[PDB]
């Protein structure tokens, strides 16, 4: 029962896109079929729209505890 | 021409970045440095 | 579905300027014609300049800039001449250039005037247009000025020194029948030299179905070229540009 | 090399280890002679 | 003609062991050579060997010993060995008796004899195999041109 | 120092085509002619000439940036007519008009000289 | 300092008329009459000779060096 919001904050979007773009730039496997793209940023955005990025967000609650979220679990807006 | 950005070599941009390295600092667009994984900095205005 | 049949009427002809009227034509053609007058009627101007020695009060590039704006009589020679960057030569040759030499040694306490008269071409077909004459620089006793220059084919778009016209007066619809402009108080405005409105009115009645026509031109030459030569070379150059564009478009479509 | 005295225009050569002085005026300002290298100008 | 490796540091001299294997005593004022740590040498069995590589000596006066390469020459290699108490463990053997266990155009007044920049004069700042930078005397810029487009004054 | 070479304001440098064609996908019979190293001199006159033809449903041009020297001309004609055909007919009409104007201007010069 | 070769706006030659403008001023021509005599009608060119200061006369007083 994750009490936090099911939405992706803009900061989470920024960090996950940047990190996955850097991963793709480091010759990582791409969990979506590209369509002739070369920029890691566009490929990361395509994966985000596909909801196919393997990152797990860990939101630290202020009481020291935390919640864990799959990117596909959150609502991408 | 002076200010620069660091692009990581990948199998997609290897051709484009190779051509940029070939051009060097003289022409625009070009490049200044190759940073291999060892950390050695090959400056692209003195080593043809 | 075809271009108009223009008719020409030269109202005034002089060797420094010319005034004419083009009728049965579109506005865009007239605007492009004046643009070609200023921009793409090529002439010959002193461009390349080697200073063998300078001792005037004025630094060198000032003198080179002054020599650049000297007009030159290039009525016929500019056609057979060619652009230097296109011609095959080491630096310069008669097929694409004309050499000039200048050397004045003032050893007289009276003031000296290095003028356009002192320019010495190696071909008499091109000279300074004044040859009173244009002052280039004043010299004192003890001051020399020695140099050799080269003049080459170019047009005004590349640099204004190749601009052959000293101003192109243009007009159309002098009565403002089309009402392309809106005078807030038409009573205040002077009448053009072509306007037929008598001195009790200020605008012709607004013609709805009108179209721009009766384009009045007054082309003033610097004297580097004769005005009729300027207009003829303008039309020739614009035709050349459009023919080249047609050639490239045909090659593109065939490809 | 060759230098011009700043007062009486006396052209004169000066060594690399002698203080400057006009050879006929005693003046103590010298100007370098113009370069003998090819200099060209586009009139633009 | 001969390099040397310091094998003992003293008050006013260096004990230096050379390529010949001869220990000498020299003054403080020998010159420091630029070491080439990426130099490649061949052992006695056509195996590439670099510095810090443990190599056995199968031939030569020091045959039977095994040492770590520390410096290289065209045909010599210096081996360190902690067990050997001689010259701080440093000796030398020939490389074939081991086994692994500026453009002239620069600053030249030039003249563009071909291309859109024809007529002008400049000075070559940088030069390459194909192109060369020229500071243009005429305008307040420097640009690069093919060497074919240049003609020296 | 970054002032451009002005002589490279009208000269095609190497690897540059004078004109290229791109069939726009939004509307049928619509083409975009991108011409390099040109300005309003050809764009305005060609736009007017294309507007003269009734078979040309739409004709216009723009310059994407004044410092650059691309001009992009959009041409749309009826669905029985090529836009390239309209472009070529417009160029031929303009060239014929300017040749006629040259002839008449020479005649007028001679008339004013004798007169 | 020296007279410009051409009017900046329109481009008519003016470098062969400053000395003549001075000479006609010595004839006590009104300045407008002088400029009309030299064929300068558009005020772009009239600005040139009306507003030019010829400092070169004050600069030649020094030594030629
Ligand atoms: Zn030639
Ligand atoms: Zn002296
Ligand atoms: Zn003016």
DSSP output for E50-113: -TT-EEEE-SSTTTT-EEEEEEE-SS-EEEE-SS--SGGGEEEE-GGGEEE---TTTT-EEEE-
Residues sharing a CB contact under 8 Å with residue F26, sequence separation 6 or more, in sequence order? none
Structure tokens at E119: 């007529």
Closest chain C residue by Cα to residue G42 = C167
Report how far residue G55's alpha carbon sits from residue G65's, in angstroms, rounded to the nearest whole number. Answer: 19
Neighbours of chain C (3+ CB pairs under 8 A): D, E, F, G
Identify the burial level of E45 via C-beta atoms within 10 angstroms of its C-beta, where 0-12 means exposed, 13-18 middle and 19 or more buried. Answer: exposed
CA dist., res. C109 & res. D32, Å (int): 25
Q: At what angle do helices A40-50 and A10-25 cross, to 10 degrees?
A: 120
At residue C182, the 3 state secondary structure works out as coil
Q: How many angstroms separate the CA atoms of C83 and E101, rounded?
A: 73
User: Phi and psi of B47, rounded to 5°?
Assistant: -125, 80
Consecutive H or E run containing A42: helix A40-50
Structure tokens at G31: 């300045």
Residue extents of the structural domains in chain C: 1-42+161-255, 43-160
Pick the CATH number of F1-115 from 3.40.50.2300, 3.10.20.30, 3.90.190.10, 3.30.1360.10: 3.30.1360.10
Answer whether E119 sits within 8 Å of C84, measured CB to CB.
Answer: yes
Is B22 within 8 Å of chain E by CB?
Answer: no
Tokens of C143: 């001051």
The whole-angstrom separation of Cα G28 and Cα F115 is: 40
Chain C residue nearest residue D8, CA to CA: C142
8 A C-beta contact, residue G16 and residue C116: yes
H or E stretch including D13? strand D11-13
Say which residues have a Cβ less than 8 Å from residue F56's Cβ, sequence separation at least 6. F50, F75, F76, F77, F86
Residue A66: its H or E element = strand A66-70
Q: Among the bound ligands, name the one nearest to the CA of residue D12.
A: 2
| CATH H superfamily, domain C43-160 | DNA-directed RNA polymerase, insert domain (2.170.120.12)
Residue B29 preceded by cis peptide, ω within 30:
yes
Distance CA F75, CA F54 (A): 13
Interface present between C and E (3 or more CB pairs within 8 Å): yes
CATH number at residue G56: 1.10.10.60
CA distance D17 to D19: 7
How far, in Å, are C46, D18, D32, E123 from residue E145 at the CA level?
25, 45, 33, 12
CA angle E24, E30, E32 (to 5 degrees): 120
E122 contacts: CB under 8 Å, gap ≥ 6:
E109, E110, E111, E112, E134, E135, E136, E137, E138, E142
Dig out the tokens for B15 from the structure: 């051709």
State both tokens at C223.
């004297």
C-alpha–C-alpha distance, residues F77 and F56, integer Å: 4
Q: What tokens appear for F54 in the block?
A: 């009734």
The span from the CA of E110 to the CA of E153, in Å, is 6
Tokens at residue E149, please? 């487009």
Q: Residue D11, annotated ligand binder?
A: no
Q: Residues 6 or more apart from C59 whose CB is under 8 A from it?
A: none
Contacts of A11 (CB under 8 A, 6+ apart): none
Chains touching chain E, criterion 3+ CB pairs below 8 Å: B, C, D, F
Yes or no, beta carbons of B11 and A26 under 8 Å apart: no
Euclidean distance between CA atoms F73 and F75, whole angstroms: 6
Is E137 an 8 Å CB contact of chain D?
Answer: yes
CA atoms of F88 and C140, how far apart (whole Å): 63
* 3-state SS class at D9: coil
Contact B17, B4 (CB under 8 A): no
Phi-psi region of A71 (alpha: psi -120 to 50; beta: other; left: phi over 0): alpha
C165, C208, E3 from E9: Cα distances, Å: 87, 107, 17
Is C103 strand, coil or helix? strand
Task: Calculate Rg over the CA atoms of chain F.
Answer: 18
Each residue of E30-43: b (16+ CB within 10 Å) or e?
A: eeeeeeeeeeebeb
CATH classification (class only), C1-42+161-255:
alpha beta
Please answer whether residues D30 and D3 qualify as being in contact, where contact means their C-beta atoms are separated by less than 8 angstroms. Answer: yes
Distance between CA atoms of residues G55 and G59, nearest Å: 6
Taking CB atoms within 8 Å and a gap of at least 24, the contacts of E121-127 are: E121/D38, E121/D39, E121/D40, E121/E153, E124/E150, E126/B26, E126/B45, E127/E103
Q: Which two tokens stand for residue B12?
A: 């997609």
Q: Is the distance from CB of E123 to CB of E138 less than 8 angstroms?
A: no
CB F31 within 8 A of CB F23: yes
- Residue F31: name the closest of F61, F53, F68 by CA: F61
3-state DSSP call for residue F97? helix
Interface of E with C (CB under 8 A): 111, 113, 115-116, 118-119, 151
Number of domains forming the structure of chain G: 1
Distance CA C222, CA F74 (A): 39
Closest C-alpha to C231, from C168, C174, C172: C168
From the CB of residue C127, how many other CB atoms can be counted at a distance below 10 Å?
A: 17
Q: Using CB atoms within 10 A of its CB, is residue F10 exposed (0-12), middle (13-18) or buried (19+)?
A: middle
DSSP assigned state of F109: H
Q: Is G19 helix (H, G, I), strand (E, B) or coil?
A: helix
Radius of gyration of chain E (CA): 26
Report the distance separating Cα F90 and Cα C58, nearest Å: 53
Q: Which two tokens stand for residue G8?
A: 């900046």
Pick the closest to residue D9 from A42, C55, C74 (CA basis): C55
For every residue of C39-79, DSSP letters joined together read HS--EEEEEEEEEEEE-SSS-HHHHHHHHHT--B--TTHHH
Residues in chain A within 8 Å Cβ distance of B10: 24-25, 27, 40
Ligand 3 mean position, distance from CA G51 (Å): 11
Counts for chain C of helices (H) and strands (E), in that order: 4, 10
Distance from C-alpha of D31 to C-alpha of D5, rounded to nearest angstrom? 7
Q: In what order do the strands lie in the sheet with F56-62?
A: F19-23, F30-36, F70-77, F56-62
Residue G28 main-chain phi, psi, to 5 deg: 60, 35
Q: Check if the beta carbon of residue C15 is closer than 8 Å to that of residue C24.
A: no
Helical packing angle, F40-52 and C27-39, nearest 10°: 160
Q: How far apart are CA F70 and CA F60, in angstroms?
A: 14
Ligand 2 centroid from CA C144, angstroms: 21
Largest CA distance in chain A: 46
**Residues C164 and C69 sit within 8 Å (Cβ to Cβ):** no
Neighbours of D12 (CB within 10 A): 14
Ligand 1 centre and the CA of C83: distance in Å? 8
How far is it, in rounded angstroms, from Cα E146 to Cα E132? 6
Element (H, E) at F103: helix F83-114
**Contact flag F11-E140 (C-beta cutoff 8 Å):** no
User: Residues E102-132, buried b or exposed e (16+ Cβ, 10 A)?
Assistant: eeebeebebbbbbebbbbbbbbbebbeeebb
- Nearest chain F CA: its distance from C119 CA (Å): 27
Please report, in angstroms and rounded to a whole number, the separation of the first and last CA atoms in chain C. 28
CB atoms within 10 A of CB G39: 10
Beta pairing, strands E54-57 & E48-49: unpaired
- List, as one string, the DSSP characters of C110-169: S-EEEEGGG-EESSTTS-BS-----EEEEE-TTEEEEEEEEEEEE-TTT-GGG--EEEEE
Task: With beta carbons under 8 A apart, name residues in chain G contacting D6.
Answer: 65
Which residues on chain G are in Cβ contact (under 8 Å) with D9?
Answer: 63-65
First to last CA, chain E: 42
Domain ranges, residue D30: 1-44
What is the domain partition of chain F in residue ranges?
Answer: 1-115
Q: How far apart are CA F77 and CA F30, in angstroms?
A: 7
Nearest to C111 by CA among C134, C143, C70, C133: C143
Whole-number CA gyration radius for chain B: 10
Contacts of A60 (CB under 8 A, 6+ apart): A66
Q: Do E98 and E55 contact (CB within 8 A), yes or no?
A: yes
Chain G: touching chains (3 or more CB pairs < 8 Å): C, D
Backbone phi, psi, residue C88, to 5°: -100, 100
- What is the Cα–Cα distance from A23 to A44, expressed in whole angstroms? 9
Compute how many other C-beta atoms are within 10 angstroms of the C-beta atom of residue C137. 22
Q: Which fold has domain A1-77?
A: Eukaryotic RPB6 RNA polymerase subunit (3.90.940)
Task: Give the separation between CA E77 and CA C36, rounded to whole angstroms.
Answer: 78
The residue with tokens 């979220």 is: A69
How far apart (Å, rounded) are the C-alpha atoms in residues E53 and E120? Answer: 58
Beta bridge partners of C170: C217
Q: Is C163:C74 a contact under the CB 8 Å cutoff?
A: no
Q: What is the chain D residue with the closest CA to C65?
A: D43
Total structural domains within chain D: 1
Under a CB-based contact definition with an 8 Å cutoff, are residues F59 and F76 in contact? yes
| Rounded Cα gap, residues E82 and C245, in angstroms | 83
Q: Which two tokens stand for residue C221?
A: 């030459």
Say which DSSP state G6 is in: B
For residues A51 and A37, the answer to whether their CB atoms sit within 8 Å is: no
Burial of residue F24, with CB atoms counted within 10 A of its CB: 0-12 exposed, 13-18 middle, 19 or more buried: middle
Residue C189 CA to residue C37 CA, distance in Å, equals 29
- E26 pairs with which residues across the strands? E14
Dihedral sign, CA of C142, C147, C151, C155?
Answer: negative
Q: Chain B partners of A25 at a C-beta cutoff of 8 Å? A: 8, 10
- Residues forming beta bridges with residue D2, ordered by sequence position: D13
Cα torsion angle, C202, C204, C205, C211, sign = negative
């Amino acid at each position: 029962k994750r009490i936090t919001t099911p939405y992706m904050t803009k900061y989470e979007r920024a960090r996950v896109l940047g990190t996955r773009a850097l991963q793709i730039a480091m010759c990582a496997p791409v969990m979506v079929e590209l369509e002739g793209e070369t920029d890691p940023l566009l490929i990361a955005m395509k994966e985000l729209k596909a909801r196919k990025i393997p990152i797990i967000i860990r939101r630290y609650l202020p009481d020291g505890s935390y919640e864990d979220w799959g990117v596909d679990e959150l609502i991408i807006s | 021409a002076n200010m620069t950005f660091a692009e990581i070599v990948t199998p997609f941009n290897i051709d484009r970045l190779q051509e940029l390295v070939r051009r060097g600092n003289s022409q625009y667009p070009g490049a200044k440095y190759i940073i291999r994984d060892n950390g050695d900095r090959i400056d692209l205005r003195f080593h043809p | 579905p075809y271009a108009n049949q223009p008719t020409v009427r030269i109202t005034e002809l002089t060797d420094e300027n010319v005034k004419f009227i083009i009728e049965n034509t579109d506005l865009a053609v007239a605007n492009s014609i004046r643009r070609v007058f200023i921009a793409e009627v090529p002439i010959i101007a002193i461009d390349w300049v080697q200073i063998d020695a300078n001792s005037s009060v004025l630094h060198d590039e000032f003198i080179a800039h002054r020599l650049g704006l000297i007009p030159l009589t290039s009525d016929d020679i500019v056609d057979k001449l060619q652009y230097s960057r296109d011609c095959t030569c080491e630096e310069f040759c008669p097929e694409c250039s004309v050499e000039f030499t200048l050397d004045v040694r003032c050893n007289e306490d009276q003031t000296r005037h290095v003028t356009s008269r002192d320019l010495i071409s190696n071909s008499p077909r091109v000279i300074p247009v004044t040859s009173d004459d244009i002052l280039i620089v004043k010299l004192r006793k003890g001051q020399e000025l020695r140099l050799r220059a080269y003049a080459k084919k170019g047009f005004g778009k590349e640099h204004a020194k190749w601009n052959p016209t000293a101003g192109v007066a243009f007009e159309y619809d002098p009565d403002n029948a089309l009402r392309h402009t809106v005078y807030p108080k038409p009573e205040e405005w002077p009448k053009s030299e072509y306007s037929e409105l008598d001195e009790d009115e200020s605008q012709a009645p607004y013609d709805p179905n009108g179209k721009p026509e009766r384009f009045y031109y007054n082309v003033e030459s610097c004297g580097s070229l004769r005005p009729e030569t300027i207009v003829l070379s303008a039309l020739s150059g614009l035709k050349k540009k459009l023919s080249d564009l047609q050639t490239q478009l045909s090659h593109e479509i065939q490809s | 090399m060759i230098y011009i005295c700043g007062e009486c225009h006396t052209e004169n050569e000066i060594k690399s280890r002698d203080p400057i002085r006009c050879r006929e005026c005693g003046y103590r300002i010298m100007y370098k002679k113009r370069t003998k290298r090819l200099v060209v100008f586009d009139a633009r | 003609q001969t390099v040397g490796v310091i094998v003992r540091l003293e008050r006013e001299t260096f004990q230096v062991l050379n390529m010949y294997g001869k220990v000498v005593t020299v003054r403080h004022q020998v010159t420091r050579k630029k070491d080439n740590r990426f130099a490649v040498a061949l052992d006695s069995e056509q195996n590439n060997i670099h510095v810090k590589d443990i190599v056995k000596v199968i031939d030569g006066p020091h045959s039977g010993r095994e040492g770590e390469i520390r410096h290289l020459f065209r045909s010599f290699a210096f081996l360190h060995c902690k067990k050997l108490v001689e010259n701080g463990g440093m000796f030398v053997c020939k490389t074939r008796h081991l086994v692994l266990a500026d453009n002239e155009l620069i600053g030249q007044t030039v003249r563009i004899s071909q291309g859109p920049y024809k007529g002008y004069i400049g000075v070559v700042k940088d030069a390459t195999e194909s192109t060369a930078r020229v500071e243009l005397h005429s305008t307040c810029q420097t640009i690069s041109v093919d060497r074919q487009r240049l003609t020296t004054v | 120092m970054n002032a451009p070479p002005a002589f490279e304001s009208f000269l095609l440098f190497e690897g540059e085509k004078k004109i290229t064609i791109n069939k726009d996908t939004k509307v049928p019979n619509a083409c975009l002619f991108t011409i390099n190293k040109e300005d309003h001199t050809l764009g305005n006159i060609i736009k007017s000439q294309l507007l003269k033809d009734p078979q040309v449903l739409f004709a216009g041009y723009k310059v994407p940036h004044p410092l650059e020297h691309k001009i992009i001309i959009r041409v749309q004609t009826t669905p029985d007519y090529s836009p390239q055909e309209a472009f070529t007919n417009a160029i031929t009409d303009l060239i014929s008009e300017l040749s006629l104007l040259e002839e008449r201007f020479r005649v007028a010069i001679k008339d004013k000289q004798e007169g | 300092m020296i007279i410009p070769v051409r009017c900046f706006t329109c481009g008519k030659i003016v470098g062969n008329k400053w000395e003549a403008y001075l000479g006609l001023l010595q004839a006590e021509y009104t300045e407008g009459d002088a400029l009309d005599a030299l064929g300068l009608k558009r005020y772009c060119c009239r600005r040139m000779l009306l507003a030019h200061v010829d400092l070169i006369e004050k600069l030649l007083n020094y030594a030629p060096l």
